[PDB]
Design a protein around this ligand. Structure first.
Ligand code: HEM
Ligand SMILES: Oc1ccccc1-c1ccccc1O
Length: 137
């Protein structure tokens, strides 16, 4: 289920974080507008950068927290406000988050593993709704 998937991802978080974020960047190349220093790089080049590993893992450290605090794939309102108010998210719209969650769900569906893809899809939609409610355009 969803809870086991959190334990699975946390068990190899630096590789799942990198693979899912690369799935997102390759699926939605225009999302590089928010990640200038990742332009014109192969996946292997990105995975060699200190910063890439360290920023993507920290992102997923918080994503797993938010997942873990959710009830029935409904995230806390306090976690959504933090994500809207964060200065690093100043320009973003819910569309940025929707795309990340589509890529994560498709990564899960294509994996060999018994991830609860439908729970991550609901989680993504509930998080987008909570970001909207907390004031993200
Ligand atoms: C649930 C989803 C997300 C979580 C939990 C999250 C979390 C975080 C965290 C913890 C940081 C700080 C990273 C660090 O200090 O190294 C960060 C930075 C950032 N996030 Fe997010 N984020 C999420 C979704 C997104 C999305 C969808 C975008 C853009 C499409 C985005 C864009 C950024 C940018 C541009 C930064 C700053 C880049 C930098 O570190 O210099 N985030 N995010
Ligand atoms: O790669 C990054 C570097 C810096 C800050 C955030 C990310 C990131 C990684 C995966 C998903 C969303 C993100 O904002």
């Amino acid at each position: 289920g969803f809870k086991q998937d959190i334990a699975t991802l946390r068990g190899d978080l630096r590789t799942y974080a990198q693979d899912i974020f690369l799935a997102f960047l390759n699926k939605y190349p225009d999302e590089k507008r928010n990640f200038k220093n990742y332009v014109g790089k192969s996946d292997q080049e990105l995975k060699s950068m200190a910063k890439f590993g360290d920023h993507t893992e920290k992102v997923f450290n918080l994503m797993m927290e938010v997942a873990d605090r959710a009830t029935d794939c409904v995230p806390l309102a306090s976690d959504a406000s933090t994500l809207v108010q964060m200065k690093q998210h100043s320009g973003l719209t819910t569309g940025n988050f929707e795309k990340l969650f589509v890529a994560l769900v498709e990564y899960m569906r294509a994996s060999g593993q018994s991830f609860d893809s439908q729970s991550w899809d609901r989680f993504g939609k509930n998080l987008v709704s909570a970001l909207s409610s907390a004031g993200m355009k």
